[PDB]
């Protein structure tokens, strides 16, 4: 029981897929893979098919490939990209060198939405609500996204949103200041900082912190939220990070009600809770969902958490063939979701 595959070359890339997937149309490419829109004749669904690029090029690529497949197989939530299918044209482990991932076609990203004029407060509520609902789920599996940005948020014509964990403008614009300072013990609230930046941008139509580099990025952040107070400075072990931060002209926290004047005061209150410099004081996804700003969407009985997620593989140092074999086992054990 193996489907019939057919091959085709699209934009320099060869695609070998099952006959069920028709009318492949390139959507975009990147360092880690390329994506085509297609029509799935078995389900009647429009899908996006991602072909991984050089999945076993090195130990790093091989572990990344396994990581992505494991993550995607685990994510089962309406606001997180999951898998409809995964396949390989390879007939055996020995000749296994290509991995294809299939999900529901979304068709646009959040950047396309903010670009095409500004949104109503109701749209901001709905979009951010969905991000947080997806994040609550991801975070409950002890996963940190780490690179939330508009381009990693897929959105369909119904304004339904799904978080893309990977990852085929600048990432740094949405990155938590503790990451810009290279803190190795950052927590899940790095993602809340990013949601704060995204929400600000949806409300104003402008990138909140458009830094030109890591130093400029930190400078832009501190100008809005103020330079660190005593409680936060005490948590910084890095002497250079402290010499830098403390050698900057001291700056107060700006009045958010003034900076985002015109916005819904509930949105401004939430933003202030997300864009707190000290990650230990930043609101969590679960807490954010209960915020008054989302009263028309919040339902505690329908904001589910994830099943336990085993990431013990992350601490493993294996050979390429071992990561390849594990990935292969995960391709073969895949059971599609019910139609
Ligand atoms: C184009 O429609 C669509 N829908 C769902 C996922 C993906 C996807 C995926 C993707 C991820 C997993 C998968 F199984 C299938 C596709 N990776 C990146 N994207 C998009 C590509 C365009 C870009 O603007 C936004 C990310 N694409
Ligand atoms: F300027 C800044 C900006 C952000 C931070 C910060 N927020 N949460 C944790 C930290 C942090 C940064 C560096 N080292 C430990 C902790 C600290 C100083």
Query: What spacing in Å lies between the alpha carbon of 85 and ligand 1's midpoint?
Result: 14
- Could you tell which of 172, 175, 178, 220 is best to mutate to test the pocket of ligand 2, judged by most ligand atoms within 8 Å of the CB? 178
Q: What tokens appear for 13 in the block?
A: 């890339």
Nearest CA to ligand 2 atom 3: 177
Which class would CATH give 2-107+306-335? alpha beta
CA distances to 52, 168, 206, 331 from 30, rounded to whole Å, are 10, 5, 26, 22
Instruction: State the helix-helix crossing angle for 59-74 and 320-333, rounded to 10 degrees.
Output: 20
Q: Whose CA is nearest to atom 1 of ligand 1?
A: 107
How far apart, in whole angstroms, are the C-alpha atoms of residue 258 and residue 254?
8
Q: How far is CA 274 from CA 181, 186, 218, 314, in A?
A: 18, 15, 16, 29
Task: Among 13, 30, 35, 109, say which to mutate for ligand 1: greatest number of ligand atoms within 8 Å of CB.
Answer: 35
Resolution (Å units): 2.0
35 lines ligand 1 (CB under 6 A): yes
Task: Give residue numbers after which the chain breaks (C–N above 2.5 Å).
Answer: 168
Could you say which ligand is closest to the alpha carbon of residue 279? 2
Where do the DSSP E strands lie in the chain? 5-10, 13-18, 21-29, 33-40, 45-52, 85-87, 100-104, 108-109, 153-155, 161-163
- DSSP code of residue 167: -
Instruction: Give domain 108-305's CATH architecture.
Output: Orthogonal Bundle (1.10)
Name the residue ranges covered by the structural domains of the chain. 2-107+306-335, 108-305
**165 in active site:** yes
């Amino acid at each position: 029981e193996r489907p019939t595959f057919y091959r085709q070359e699209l934009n320099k890339t060869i695609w070998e897929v099952p006959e069920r997937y028709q009318n492949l149309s390139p959507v975009g490419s990147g360092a880690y893979g390329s994506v085509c829109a297609a029509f799935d004749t078995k389900t009647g669904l429009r899908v996006a098919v991602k072909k991984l690029s050089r999945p076993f090029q090195s130990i790093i690529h091989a572990k990344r490939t396994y990581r992505e497949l494991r993550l995607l197989k685990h994510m089962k939530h309406e606001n997180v990209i999951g898998l409809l299918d995964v396949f390989t044209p390879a007939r055996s482990l020995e000749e296994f060198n290509d991995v294809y991932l299939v999900t529901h076609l979304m068709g646009a990203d959040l950047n396309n939405i903010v670009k095409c004029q500004k949104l109503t407060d109701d749209h901001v509520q709905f979009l951010i609500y969905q991000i947080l609902r997806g994040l609550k789920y991801i975070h409950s599996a002890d996963i940190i996204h780490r690179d939330l940005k508009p381009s990693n948020l897929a959105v369909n014509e119904d304004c339904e949103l799904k978080i893309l964990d990977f990852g085929l403008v600048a990432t740094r614009w949405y990155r938590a200041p503790e990451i810009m300072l290279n803190w190795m013990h950052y927590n899940q609230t790095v993602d809340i900082w990013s949601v704060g930046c995204i929400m600000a941008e949806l409300l104003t139509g402008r990138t909140l912190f458009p830094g030109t580099d890591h130093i400029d990025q930190l400078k832009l952040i501190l100008r809005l939220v103020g330079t660190p107070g005593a409680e936060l400075l005490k948590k910084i072990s890095s002497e250079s990070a402290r010499n830098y931060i403390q050698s900057l002209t001291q700056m107060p926290k700006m009045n958010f009600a003034n900076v985002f004047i015109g916005a819904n005061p509930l949105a401004v209150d939430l933003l202030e809770k997300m864009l707190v410099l000290d990650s230990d004081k930043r609101i969590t996804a679960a807490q954010a969902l209960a915020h008054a700003y989302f009263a028309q969407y919040h339902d505690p009985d329908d904001e589910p958490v994830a099943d336990p997620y085993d990431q013990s593989f992350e601490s493993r140092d294996l050979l390429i063939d071992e990561w390849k074999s594990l990935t292969y086992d995960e391709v073969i054990s895949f059971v599609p979701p019910p139609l």
